[PDB]
């Protein structure tokens, strides 16, 4: 598993937090939104096999290829 570094090395950058839409456009209701955000709260404190599993599906062969190719370029540059 991967975890976040210590405070002085934590490179923060401002995120444009999205305006909240109506519950029907998310999980369905306020109760369900709260329930599901709690469910997925567990996954925010690390990066591991479940995250990698999801990344794999959502990117497919083409997404993985381009990410690998680009990571190689980051490494070449560094």
């Amino acid at each position: 598993r991967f975890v976040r570094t210590v405070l002085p090395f934590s490179q923060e950058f401002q995120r444009d937090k999205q305006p909240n839409a109506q519950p029907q456009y998310l999980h369905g209701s306020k109760a369900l939104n709260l329930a599901y955000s709690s469910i997925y709260g567990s996954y925010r404190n690390f990066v591991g096999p479940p995250h990698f599993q999801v990344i794999c599906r959502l990117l497919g062969y083409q997404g993985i290829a381009v990410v690998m190719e680009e990571l190689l370029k980051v490494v070449k540059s560094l």
Partner: peptide, 25 residues
């Protein structure tokens, strides 16, 4: 619309980089 907009405010007040070319794209 205006009546509800100025009812939410009524309740709110009386309460409280050059390494990868893909990055550019």
């Amino acid at each position: 619309t205006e009546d509800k907009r100025k009812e939410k405010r009524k309740q709110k007040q009386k309460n409280l980089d050059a390494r990868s070319v893909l990055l550019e794209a």
